[PDB]
Amino acid sequence: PANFCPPAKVNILAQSRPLSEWPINLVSKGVQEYVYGLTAAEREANGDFGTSRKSLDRWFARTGVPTHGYTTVQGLNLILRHTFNRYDGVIKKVETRNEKRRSPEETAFGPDGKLKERPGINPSIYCYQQVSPVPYNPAKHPALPFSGVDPGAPLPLGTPNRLSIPKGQPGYVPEWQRPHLSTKNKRIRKWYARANWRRKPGRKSVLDEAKLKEAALKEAIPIIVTIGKDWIVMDARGLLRAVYWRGIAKPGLSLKELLGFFSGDPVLDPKRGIATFTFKLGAVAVHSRKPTRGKKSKELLLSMTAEKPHVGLVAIDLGQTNPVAAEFSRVKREGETLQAEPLGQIVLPDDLVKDLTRYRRAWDATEEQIKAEAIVQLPEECRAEVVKVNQMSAEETKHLILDRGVSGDLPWEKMTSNTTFISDHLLAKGVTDQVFFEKKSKGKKKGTETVKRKDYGWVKLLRPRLSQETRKAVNDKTWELKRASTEYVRLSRRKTELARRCVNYIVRETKRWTQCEDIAIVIEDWFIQVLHKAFSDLALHRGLPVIEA
RNA sequence: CUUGCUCGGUUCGCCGAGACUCCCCUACGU
DNA sequence: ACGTAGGGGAGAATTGGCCA
DNA sequence: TGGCCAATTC
Numbered sequence: 001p002a003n004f005c006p007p008a009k010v011n012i013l014a015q016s017r018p019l020s021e022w023p024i025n026l027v028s029k030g031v032q033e034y035v036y037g038l039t040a041a042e043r044e045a046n047g048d049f050g051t052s053r054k055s056l057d058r059w060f061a062r063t064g065v066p067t068h069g070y071t072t073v074q075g076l077n078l079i080l081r082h083t084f085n086r087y088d089g090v091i092k093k094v095e096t097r098n099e100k101r102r103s104p105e106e107t108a109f110g111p112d113g114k115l116k117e118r119p120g121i122n123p124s125i126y127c128y129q130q131v132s133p134v135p136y137n138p139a140k141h142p143a144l145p146f147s148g149v150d151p152g153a154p155l156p157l158g159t160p161n162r163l164s165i166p167k168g169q170p171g172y173v174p175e176w177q178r179p180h181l182s183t184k185n186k187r188i189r190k191w192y193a194r195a196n197w198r199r200k201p202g203r204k205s206v207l208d209e210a211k212l213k214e215a216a217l218k219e220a221i222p223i224i225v226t227i228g229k230d231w232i233v234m235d236a237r238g239l240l241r242a243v244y245w246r247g248i249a250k251p252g253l254s255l256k257e258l259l260g261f262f263s264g265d266p267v268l269d270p271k272r273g274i275a276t277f278t279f280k281l282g283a284v285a286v287h288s289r290k291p292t293r294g295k296k297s298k299e300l301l302l303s304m305t306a307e308k309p310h311v312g313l314v315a316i317d318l319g320q321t322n323p324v325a326a327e328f329s330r331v332k333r334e335g336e337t338l339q340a341e342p343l344g345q346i347v348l349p350d351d352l353v354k355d356l357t358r359y360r361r362a363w364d365a366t367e368e369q370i371k372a373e374a375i376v377q378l379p380e381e382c383r384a385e386v387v388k389v390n391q392m393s394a395e396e397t398k399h400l401i402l403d404r405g406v407s408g409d410l411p412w413e414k415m416t417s418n419t420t421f422i423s424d425h426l427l428a429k430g431v432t433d434q435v436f437f438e439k440k441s442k443g444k445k446k447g448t449e450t451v452k453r454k455d456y457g458w459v460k461l462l463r464p465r466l467s468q469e470t471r472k473a474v475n476d477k478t479w480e481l482k483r484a485s486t487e488y489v490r491l492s493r494r495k496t497e498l499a500r501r502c503v504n505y506i507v508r509e510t511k512r513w514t515q516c517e518d519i520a521i522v523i524e525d526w527f528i529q530v531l532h533k534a535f536s537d538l539a540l541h542r543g544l545p546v547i548e549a
Numbered sequence: 550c551u552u553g554c555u556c557g558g559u560u561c562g563c564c565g566a567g568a569c570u571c572c573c574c575u576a577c578g579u
Numbered sequence: 580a581c582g583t584a585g586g587g588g589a590g591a592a593t594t595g596g597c598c599a
Numbered sequence: 600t601g602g603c604c605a606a607t608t609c
Contacts, residue, residue, distance in 0.1 A: 004570085006570050007571045007572085007589075009553075009554095009569095009571085011552065051606095051607075052606085073605075073607080085586095085588085086574075086586080086588090089574085090586075093585060096585085096586090117575055118575080119573095119575065120573080121573090121574090122572090122588080123573075124572075124588080126589075129590075129592090129605095156551080159551085168562085171562090172562055173562085173563070174562055176560070177563075182564075186566090187550045188550055188551070190551050191562095192552095193551085193552080194553080195554080195555090196563055202558085203561070205561050205562095236552090240550080240552085241552070243550095244550040245550065251550075263589085265590055276571070276589070277589095278571090355556070367581085492582090493568085494555060494568095496568080497556090498567090499568095500567090501568070504568085529582090
């Protein structure tokens with residue numbers, strides 16, 4: 001049963017007035033600011049808004065929240081059921097911990113009676129059936145400098161005769177590039193794509209955004225959403241690309257049926273200018289599972305092999321010099337036991353490893369350029385303290401132990417952590433009986449083994465408290481300037497993309513090596529966190545079982 | 550495989566390789 | 580040591596009052 | 600009749 005609905009984002013080409021000034025947005029803001037600032041008794045009393053016109057009108061009558069002229073029942077139910085659920089999300093977040101305590105109780109209501117942690121305003125316009133997107137029609141819709149395609153006529157492709165375009169014209173592939181072109185079904189980029197003109201280290205081209213914008217606008221696929229007397233006009237080529245890369249639609253489809261793979265209830269965020277569409281329940285035939293927790297794997301694979309008589313595995317072994325050391329296998333079903341035959345183990349290829357090691361030199365090179373400039377901008381009283389702490393214990397503890405009078409040359413190098421040589425060199429200058437001791441818990445229930453301290457324990461005790469004076473300057477200004485640089489939010493997405501690239505390569509090699517469409521991924525009981533998250537996400541985004549053995 | 554996004558090449562005329570589960574919200578935990 | 584946790588979202592078939 | 604489009608409910 002298909003139960004996953006991945007998103008598809010489209011751009012906005014025109015709009016009557018900014019989305020923040022629409023009556024629906026103002027009503028949503030008013031309702032949210034009213035609901036978030038009321039107590040539990042007021043929530044129980046003011047919780048009879050219902051799903052009827054006679055009930056919504058009565059609610060807006062007694063509460064007195066401005067209605068801003070918006071009186072649509074379909075679009076108001078979405079606003080009010082979300083807003084009260086957001087309010088009743090503080091209670092259950094705390095109440096989840098309340099039952100953890102049972103397995104002074106925490107309360108989400110403060111002394112004033114209102115929520116201490118109250119939710120912010122959601123800046124979204126959730127569309128409904130009555131404002132569903134429709135193909136742009138110049139006669140029936142406001143006039144725009146755009147061409148509306150025939151809803152039933154076949155949508156055009158890009159440039160069919162790519163090699164026949166003459167010289168001196170857009171899209172002309174030069175002769176010397178002809179011998180080595182691509183042969184796979186590659187996504188076709190038009191000549192006005194910003195990716196082909198973006199500023200680069202050595203691109204040596206001139207980006208005239210005006211001509212690219214005009215050329216892109218002359219060949220758009222306009223669709224229109226009207227709410228009340230307002231409207232927005234979007235570009236549907238994002239939906240076309242979404243249905244093309246997934247293979248669910250072959251070229252030669254119309255605009256009436258292109259919108260037919262997506263739900264007619266988009267979501268609009270005014271700050272960016274993007275409409276987020278969603279596939280219907282069945283467009284992408286993906287059943288979203290969750291990773292298996294051990295003993296359920298020996299039941300999952302039995303049923304998986306009960307359908308396909310040959311299933312392929314992959315043993316993702318994180319934590320080596322190569323991040324992904326895959327180990328393939330194939331399983332057969334005889335009885336209650338599964339029989340496997342290894343096929344071989346590969347490592348992640350060098351080119352992808354090169355991309356990883358060139359990204360890893362872009363994050364450690366920004367965690368310096370951000371953290372250092374966050375440190376330099378502390379107040380002088382905090383800045384001097386943190387600077388002193390940074391250089392603290394470098395030679396301070398060495399000077400202290402020399403003041404103690406021990407021989408400061410035996411533990412010179414590597415400290416021989418196996419033999420806890422700190423205690424040895426304390427014993428050297430007659431400090432054997434002043435050696436501080438540590439308790440051990442070797443016993444199953446308890447244990448009193450207060451004995452010579454280990455080297456790690458010595459390091460813990462000899463080093464000072466470091467930066468506990470503030471703990472809210474270095475740990476706060478850095479995390480505040482993290483969002484002040486767009487490079488960080490770009491690098492997080494780059495890390496996720498690289499992790500997904502590695503996962504995709506491993507999955508396709510598992511399919512190829514095992515010669516089976518049904519495959520499974522097993523993970524045992526840096527890039528480690530992002531790779532584990534990416535490998536676990538296949539059960540939720542693509543349906544491939546993931547096992548934590 | 551027409552928009553948008555990420556990483557490379559160049560003769561600058563564009564083409565080689567990627568991701569496609571995403572949004573707000575409140576705190577500071579492991 | 581660096582991002583993380585946990586709350587909230589992401590329809591549409593049917594029906595009715597309904598003027599031209 | 601019937602066409603249009605908010606309102607009613609799962």
